[PDB]
Design a protein around this nucleic acid. Sequence first.
RNA 1: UCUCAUGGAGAGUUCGAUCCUGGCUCAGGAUGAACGCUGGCGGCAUGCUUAACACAUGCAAGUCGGACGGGAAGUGGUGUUUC
Length: 154
Amino acid sequence: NVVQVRRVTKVVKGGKHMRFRAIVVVGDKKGQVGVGVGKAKEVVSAVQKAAVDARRNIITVPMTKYLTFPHRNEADYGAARVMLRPAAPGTGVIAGGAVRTVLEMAGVENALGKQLGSNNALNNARATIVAVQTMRQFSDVARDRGIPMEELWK
RNA sequence: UCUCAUGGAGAGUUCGAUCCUGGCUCAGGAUGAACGCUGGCGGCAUGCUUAACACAUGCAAGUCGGACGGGAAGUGGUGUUUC
Ligand SMILES: [Mg+2]
Ligand SMILES: [Mg+2]
Ligand SMILES: [Mg+2]
Ligand SMILES: [Mg+2]
Ligand SMILES: [Mg+2]
Ligand SMILES: [Mg+2]
Ligand SMILES: [Mg+2]
Ligand SMILES: [Mg+2]
Ligand SMILES: [Mg+2]
Ligand SMILES: [Mg+2]
Ligand SMILES: [Mg+2]
Ligand SMILES: [Mg+2]
Ligand SMILES: [Mg+2]
Ligand SMILES: [Mg+2]
Ligand SMILES: [Mg+2]
């Protein structure tokens, strides 16, 4: 999914040397997602490079039986800060462009999110990845703390 | 994987491009609203925000004859009853 297409410029003695930068995320909508960034002379080629760079950068988002987040989380990348919190089933995904495409492509069905701090697409994507990467699923906190699930449930 | 949550979306604009700090602007709701164009019906509401500025006319607080003396309508008369 192509998030953003921009025309960046290098300048040479001749004139303006034009390129396209594409920010693109890939997902299966099944709980596997990644971000990637690419650069080329043509829209198509940059799209493609972005595709590959993403595929080799990819990770997995912890999910809950209802297709949502384990818990509430913040994240920080550059000047982009990102706020995610779990939702009740049937609320859909409500968020802004970068965060929303990332989460939607991960396959998260119900999520609250707001990017605070900056607006830049790319950074917000990476921040979202940082968020959902640090998410701890309950089985694993049970295993870490060394305490049975039902005891933390209460 | 019980319980809680029914809730927080962005976009454009400084640069040859970038990231940022930063303002301006937009998308939403609400009117005791006004104006433009258009306008079939019903249900429930609402209707001088400004000049506590002037007011023509008509009506918005009276009743009690079982507190009381009279007089005035009739009636034949203080037997009747009204104002
Ligand atoms: Mg190279
Ligand atoms: Mg900071
Ligand atoms: Mg914001
Ligand atoms: Mg400047
Ligand atoms: Mg310019
Ligand atoms: Mg700011
Ligand atoms: Mg409006
Ligand atoms: Mg008319
Ligand atoms: Mg008034
Ligand atoms: Mg008068
Ligand atoms: Mg009257
Ligand atoms: Mg009487
Ligand atoms: Mg009387
Ligand atoms: Mg009496
Ligand atoms: Mg008498």
